Design a protein around this ligand. Structure first.
Ligand code: NA
Ligand code: NA
Lengths: 476, 476
């Protein structure tokens, strides 16, 4: 079992003020793989003090020198990529192939996209096009709090730490206490990159104590948070007394609108996307809304793909899905699956319990429901397991109404070979992102939602600017 | 006395659910000039219901038609400009000349600047320059809550209602209960413009009941608030449970850094700016930091200008300052003036009590303190009366330290004929805006601060975008 009790504060790994041990569980086995410390408010004060002190000199480094640190971080990140993949796989259950090619690789892709964006960005520019007197200046917002979850850990950590570096901020990161090891290795990457003492600090801890304490701390000027909508509301409440900037990346209940004229592979692509990372993706397309004409075909295709979707441990190679991350997550998912049965949805395949043959680990069966109705829990609540809900629609208006019947609005999805129809529907759905016909958003695009999904705009230029204040100077 | 008890809801002036009378006081006389109703949560629900219903059709109007309404609003606004000036003068005490040429005229200037900005704006554009596949879409954020204060009423109302119109939002405005009449006339302007029923709604009320209730209401997606920092924190707290966008324009404690090499008129300009609108400007330059070499000259100039600054009623023509807006404001200012004396600052001129000869009205004497120290209340707290604080500095670093010794950061000011020195200092002061050498920010620039001054970006393109969500479509 790994001894990982220390925090990274002011350039050094140090003990917490008081021991408060927590085992990190490997969800593929149910066994402890490491021990960490849950920090107290004193450990937070230490980290924040180190960051405030560093900021005074870090804010005066040139963009050139900051970019050089980020390039160095990328170089060491790539060198440690398979250590990172194994760590992620172990702590949160990602099957090892996808732990390397998606969990770890998205980190490197975000880093590169920040680099490209930074090269196009200037800290001064015209305030009004064609006025050569007044100027717009961007300033480091200050010392910031960063809070990341367990589901796509390096995706979420790189999206926050890199633009904060480039902006000239210093920071305290609290990663997820159920998957902190990847962040601790990221800490080692930054230390090996010789990032100046106090610029980056890592303390472990929980939401109710350390997370809330950071969000209310008077020496932080911003909190960047990725996590559940429930937690985001409390972050926002705690931050309001010091008028911090609050940037939130929260949950989703994505609709995938599939028309009869969708390309051949639309249905398969959709079902596969739902189960990817065992459904533990805030933007996963979990409500499949299918035109009446191909509804029976959709059910049949979802059934086939589900039955062919293997489940297996994180440590095994291949394209099975892994366990879900925790017992508590497993229990919530089982309850929601049972609710689908009890509320009268059609159970197409899968259901409650461990898949046949698995004796231990938080393995959830790939599950499909059909004839799901808007009032059902499985329609409304984010499940975060490999659980798809299908229902039909008859008109474009009905599809849009169903897609918009949610408080969330992260990514919605549309499949149709009719470009005009794609455009009409894309304009009417209420989300921060829309993926049409399996096309991903380009590198350097933002990632973020509207309404209960949060309104953060992470990635590329958007992401760098969340860590800057603007200043309008009337004569430069 | 004017009978003004009605609310403007769904295209009609109607009675409140239950009478709750409040006299509007004319601060030049201490007498009631009108009676209004303080609304309840039921009146708010009515207004919001009217707005939600209107939004369904208002969001589909073209930009062309929305601009046509705003042009019509401007035309009627200009037609009613001297009614507006008299109303503002009466309800909050602005001397009538400046009630027309600044209080009312800034409204028209903001409207025109939104018009210009709207003509440059498009609701779709490229997501990434040079990518012709993905597209950025702007969508009306939804039904919004607008809350405005008493000090620059039409400035603050036009900054909120016009960009919300152009963005395709519907809205409920609650103006200040101590200066609501100008907003009610603005309501009549919009009604005469034939703006569709329910697009714009006005209910009167207070902060603790109606203001808080709007900020927590589940059918509003955004709150735009201009007011005190204390109130902004509570707006933010109430809004967090529904994850609304919250845009805040709060108070300030502006530093005016005047070097020995400032232009001839720098000192006079500074003192005059402090007393303008009787100091009731969130961005007023209330801390004058003077290079040691010209400190005695600064004191002497401030004294002369103060002694020559006349006080008089709102209804009289001329360039005297008027009363402050209320008894409660007057009492707060007197307390802060007395604090300056008690804490040992040098009283240069003015002080406590009514100016000689004034028998009634909330008239505050133009007051100057010198040798003010950072711990003094008059240095730290926003006074909102005609009260200037002077102190010297010896080095550039000392000036910057003093200017940044505040939780506020709205507008800071720098006077020096050394352009290099202006640039160095402008880059180091921590504010959303910096006015150098008496140069105003250009039309279409934003107005807003950082930290405890809020981070709203009102005006021009910035202001239109605060009422829009962004949507990134991967294939258009
Ligand atoms: Na774990
Ligand atoms: Na009044």
């Amino acid at each position: 079992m790994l001894n990982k009790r220390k925090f990274y504060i002011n350039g050094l790994w140090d003990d917490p003020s008081t021991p408060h041990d927590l085992y990190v569980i490997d969800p593929s086995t149910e066994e402890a793989c490491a021990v960490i410390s849950l920090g107290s408010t004193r450990d937070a004060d230490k980290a924040i003090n180190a960051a405030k002190k560093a900021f005074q000199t870090w804010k005066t480094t040139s963009p050139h020198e900051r970019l050089g640190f980020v390039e160095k971080i990328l170089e060491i990140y790539e060198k440690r990529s398979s250590d990172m993949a194994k760590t992620i796989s172990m702590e949160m259950g990602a099957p090892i192939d996808m732990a390397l090619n998606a969990q770890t690789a998205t980190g490197s892709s975000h880093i590169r996209n920040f680099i490209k964006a930074y090269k196009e960005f200037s800290f001064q520019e015209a305030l009004i096009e064609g006025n050569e007197q007044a100027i717009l200046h961007y300033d480091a917002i200050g010392v910031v709090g960063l809070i990341t979850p367990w589901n796509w850990p390096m995706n979420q950590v790189t999206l926050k730490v890199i633009p904060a570096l480039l902006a000239g901020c210093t920071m305290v990161l609290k990663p997820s206490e159920i998957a902190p090891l990847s962040a601790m290795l990221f800490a080692e990457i930054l230390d090996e990159a010789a990032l100046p003492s106090g610029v980056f600090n890592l303390i472990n801890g929980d939401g109710a104590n350390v997370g809330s304490y950071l969000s209310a701390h008077p020496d932080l000027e911003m909190i960047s948070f990725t996590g559940s909508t429930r937690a985001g509301k409390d972050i926002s409440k705690n931050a309001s007394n010091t008028l911090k900037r609050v940037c939130l990346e929260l949950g989703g209940k994505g609709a995938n609108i599939i028309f009869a004229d969708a390309d051949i592979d639309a249905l398969q692509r959709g079902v596969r996307h739902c189960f990817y990372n065992s459904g533990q993706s805030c933007n996963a397309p979990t409500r499949m809304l299918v035109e009446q004409a191909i509804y029976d075909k959709a059910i049949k295709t979802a059934k086939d793909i589900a039955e062919k979707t293997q489940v297996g441990p994180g440590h095994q190679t291949g394209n099975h899905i892994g366990p879900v991350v925790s017992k508590e997550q497993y229990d919530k998912i089982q309850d929601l699956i049972q609710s689908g049965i009890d509320e009268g949805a059609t159970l197409v395949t899968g259901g409650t319990g461990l898949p046949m043959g698995m004796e231990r680990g938080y393995y959830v069966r790939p599950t499909v429901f059909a004839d799901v109705k808007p009032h059902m829990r499985i329609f409304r609540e984010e499940i975060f397991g490999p659980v798809l809900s299908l229902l039909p629609f008859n008109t474009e208006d009905e599809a849009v109404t169903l897609a918009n019947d949610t408080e969330y609005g992260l990514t919605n999805y549309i499949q149709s070979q009719d470009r005009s129809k794609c455009r009409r529907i894309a304009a009417q759905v209420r989300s921060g992102m829309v993926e049409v016909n399996g096309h991903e958003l380009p590198g350097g695009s933002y990632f973020g939602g509207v309404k209960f999904s949060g309104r953060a705009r992470e990635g590329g230029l958007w992401g760098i600017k969340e860590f800057l204040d603007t200043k309008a100077i009337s004569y430069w």
